[PDB]
Ligand binder design. Structure first.
Ligand SMILES: *Cc1cc2c(cc1C)nc1c(=O)[nH]c(=O)nc-1n2C[C@H](O)[C@H](O)[C@H](O)COP(=O)(O)OP(=O)(O)OC[C@H]1O[C@@H](n2cnc3c(N)ncnc32)[C@H](O)[C@@H]1O
Length: 809
């Protein structure tokens, strides 16, 4: 038993062993896993074992995929029987809105290896004989997946792990972690102490518990979930093939073949289900493990009834087992995966809702991150720092109670959920604007989506096609192009960075040149291999003092990188996160100057207040820092101010521009605006998937700036070889629907790429999409076909930009 570990993993469940297997197979030395009692003693052993190629999301299709592919090679690897049953999986549409969901999911899977099929009821009768075909309209089918034995899965990964040099001590629970100023760790088991260069928390529902050992709120809550096992069924025994795993979405239950009977479990109402609040307040009772909850069948009876109806053999069969167990839910049901910001060398893999299908893939992910220094592909959706102080256990219970219940609701585009809202993270502006718009949840913040025109509909109305906020966004669009309008942009991520090494810090953290004093420019942080880890505004205020602006979802994601690089290069700087004390305000449109000039004594002429210049001034004797910048592409300023002034400032500006007919606007409006200027959004046109040259960002990337910035020589290798694909811009005539991004694009039979984002263009009266395509298909004038809701629409690459920006005009 060694006293210096390279990587220590707290957890012997199936996600901990996943990481040990992959880290050790990758050749990491001294991998050490510490478990409280025994492997699989957590949630894992009792799991229903369902493993599907299917995911509603986008990049999570790759986690599921990487898992399934590994799980196959695993008997062959270890000598052990993992218990992988692979009949296929089939989600049922029983309503027509559900057929629509399937068409929307299929266009999103087309540009993925994940092989997926929209199938007829005839192919489901042949596939699942005992099924009631009476209301079934269609099915979503993935061949090559099904379920697996969690025990046999975990043990098989351990044998792979041990065999490649991972040491798996148990029982040896951590009782104490102490951070060391040199970035290492001190772990404390009842066996003794040891030092790991990094630590990985994979402690299931104890994750929150262990996180506190180094003073962290991990927003996780154990949830009660039951499933049911029947006795043998004669018609089930009589089938020659194994039934494919079903999901009657409209009943909200999954079902599968267990031996010669049926295993099924529902997701009860968010009002009906139970959570382990007591375990967050008091912590998990010690001496818990290899252990279940008392069943509560009566609370899911409504759902059993439905199950009996879709599959009538159940009406006769008998129940053998009711497994009521705990699962670790984060607020949005997604796991928290990656290095935790604020603490050095602490990674997490916690809050897994679907840990058995996620384990393999998440293990290859984290491991490829540890051993490379950057994520292999982009999963900011899974990023552990997407939460914050606002993610209080109050909120954490509410939305998690929702994520459960909403497991099988219809996955709409621009989906909105209201559990736990609003949060503590709100600008003074919120209370002003709430009564007059639809507020979209972004990173805890409440920020408007679209503003209510009077006499027109204001209910929440999601759809796969154009919906009730269509023309209001048009009026908003028309508003900013004609006059002047104000949007709230307080959610931005905001970093101030002063100190002696700061230009040495930013000049290597960024690919663009460092802006002259009193200026701003758009800069990207590349990963060492060349992907766009982040885009953000670099404002240069006092010589050597910088203000960094970024997106609300990409705030702590981006800070973490800046912090770590300051640590690695041993930079002498100071970085504070001023994000919450500042409110932001965009004022954009032709009339911005006429309106803002009358509120300030500062000269706002185009000659005097240049584009991208930053300046300190007072708007109505309210101290503000104004940047001549706008994501709209229209004449405009961003006014950064203290959170208290937001109302007083907003009011002054509204009052002021009443002469020019000033009005409000929001993000939905803002999308349509920027897309016409062909502006790229990080996380959309670009993220860790993409490098800046192929995303058409050559403009912001000075490959001959003297500094060997993070990612330079990588890029120089890309530029030298030449791109394989390039980001283009398309228009298309649609009927009733617009693209939003992640729709597949077709050329003469094959799928050849995808759209990253879309919108209707209110000025040319067509639709607009950004898209990745082969270079042979990337010329201006080139036609492609874009899959939108089951129908292919012809689209054609235009010369970008559609609308010139005010300075270029
Ligand atoms: C309850 C349940 C879960 C479930 C399911 C059905 C039911 C009824 N069906 C699933 C499915 O169809 N598909 C799927 O992918 N997952 C399903 N799940 C459950 C869940 O996703 C998984 O069980 C997931 O693995 C969660 O487990 P995780 O890998 O995160 O870890 P764990 O097994 O819960 O336990 C972690 C281990 O760490 C040890 N520990 C705890 N405290 C300490 C300290 N202080 N020091 C060291 N080690 C510690 C625990 O002993 C535990 O073994």
């Amino acid at each position: 038993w060694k006293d210096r570990a390279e990587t220590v993993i707290i957890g012997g469940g199936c996600v901990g062993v996943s990481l040990a297997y992959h880290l050790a197979k990758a050749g990491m030395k001294d991998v050490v896993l510490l478990e409280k009692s025994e492997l699989t003693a957590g949630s894992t052993w009792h799991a229903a074992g369902l493993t599907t190629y299917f995911h509603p999301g986008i990049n999570l299709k790759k986690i599921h995929y990487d898992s399934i592919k590994l799980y196959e090679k695993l008997e062959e690897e270890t000598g052990q029987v993992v218990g992988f049953h692979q009949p296929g999986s089939i989600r049922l549409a029983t309503t027509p809105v559900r057929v629509d969901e399937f068409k929307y999911q299929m266009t999103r899977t087309g540009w993925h290896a994940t092989e997926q099929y929209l199938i007829e009821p005839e192919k489901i009768q042949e596939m699942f004989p005992l099924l009631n075909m009476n209301k079934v309209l269609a099915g979503l089918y993935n061949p090559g997946d099904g379920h697996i034995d969690p025990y046999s899965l975990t043990m098989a990964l351990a044998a792979g792990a041990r065999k490649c040099g991972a040491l798996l001590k148990y029982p040896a629970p951590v009782t104490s972690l102490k951070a060391r100023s040199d970035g290492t760790w001190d772990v404390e088991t009842p066996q003794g102490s040891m030092r790991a260069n990094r630590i990985v928390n994979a402690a299931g529902f104890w994750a929150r518990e262990v996180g506190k050992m180094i003073g962290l709120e991990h927003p996780l809550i154990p949830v009660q979930h039951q499933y049911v096992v029947t006795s043998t069924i004669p018609e089930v025994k009589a089938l020659k093939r194994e039934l494919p795993v079903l999901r009657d979405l409209e009943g909200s239950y999954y079902l599968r073949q267990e031996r010669d009977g049926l295993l099924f479990g529902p997701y009860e109402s968010q009002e009906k289900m139970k959570v382990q609040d007591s375990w967050v307040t008091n912590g998990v009772p010690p001496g818990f493990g290899k252990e279940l909850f008392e069943s509560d069948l009566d609370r899911i009876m409504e759902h059993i009834k439905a199950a009996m109806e879709m599959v009538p053999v159940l009406k006769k069969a008998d129940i053998i087992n009711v497994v009521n167990g705990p699962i670790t839910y984060s607020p949005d049901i997604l796991p928290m995966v990656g290095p935790h910001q604020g603490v050095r060398n602490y990674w997490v893999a916690i809050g897994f809702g679907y840990g058995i299908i996620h384990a393999g893939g998440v293990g290859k992910y984290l491991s490829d991150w540890i051993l490379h220094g950057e994520p292999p592909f982009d999963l900011i959706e899974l990023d552990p720092n997407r939460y914050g102080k606002w993610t209080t256990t109050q909120y954490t219970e509410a939305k998690a109670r929702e994520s459960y219940g909403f497991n099988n609701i219809v996955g709409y585009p621009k989906e909105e959920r209201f559990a736990g809202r609003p949060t503590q993270r709100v600008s003074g502006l919120y209370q002003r604007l709430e009564s007059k718009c639809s507020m979209g949840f972004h990173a805890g913040w409440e920020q408007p989506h679209w503003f209510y025109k009077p006499g027109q509909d204001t209910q929440y109305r999601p759809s796969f096609r154009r919906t009730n906020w269509f023309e209001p966004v048009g009026s908003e669009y028309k508003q900013v192009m004609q006059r002047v309008a104000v949007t709230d942009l307080s959610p931005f991520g905001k970093f101030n960075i002063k100190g002696q090494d700061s230009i040495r810090l930013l000049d290597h953290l960024f690919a663009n040149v460092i802006p002259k004093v009193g200026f701003t420019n758009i800069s990207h942080m590349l990963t060492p291999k060349g992907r766009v880890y982040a885009e953000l505004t670099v404002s240069h205020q006092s010589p050597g003092e910088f203000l960094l602006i970024t997106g609300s979802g990409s705030e702590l994601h981006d800070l973490r990188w800046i912090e770590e690089e300051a640590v690695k290069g041993g930079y002498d700087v100071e970085i504070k996160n001023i994000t919450d004390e500042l409110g932001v305000l965009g004022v954009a449109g032709p009339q911005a100057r006429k309106v803002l000039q009358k509120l300030t004594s500062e000269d706002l002429s185009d000659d005097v207040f240049k584009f991208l210049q930053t300046k300190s001034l007072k708007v109505s004797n309210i101290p503000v820092t104004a940047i001549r910048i706008s994501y709209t592409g229209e004449l405009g300023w961003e006014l950064y101010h203290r959170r208290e002034d937001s109302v007083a400032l907003y009011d002054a500006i509204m009052n002021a521009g009443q002469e020019e007919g000033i009005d409000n606007f929001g993000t939905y409006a803002m999308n349509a605006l920027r897309l016409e200027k062909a502006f790229r959004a990080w996380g959309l046109e670009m993220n860790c998937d993409t490098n800046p040259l192929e995303a058409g960002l050559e403009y912001f990337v000075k490959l001959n700036k003297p500094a060997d910035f993070i990612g330079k020589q990588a890029l120089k290798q890309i530029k030298a070889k030449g791109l394989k694909r390039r980001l283009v811009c398309l228009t298309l005539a649609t009927d009733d629907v617009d693209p939003e991004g992640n729709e597949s694009i077709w050329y003469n039979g094959k799928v050849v790429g995808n759209t990253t984002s879309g919108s209707y263009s209110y000025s040319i009266q067509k639709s607009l999409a950004f898209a990745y395509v082969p270079v042979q298909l990337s010329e201006v004038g080139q036609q492609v076909e874009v899959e939108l809701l089951g129908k292919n629409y012809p689209a054609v690459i235009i010369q970008e930009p559609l609308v010139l920006t005010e300075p270029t005009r």
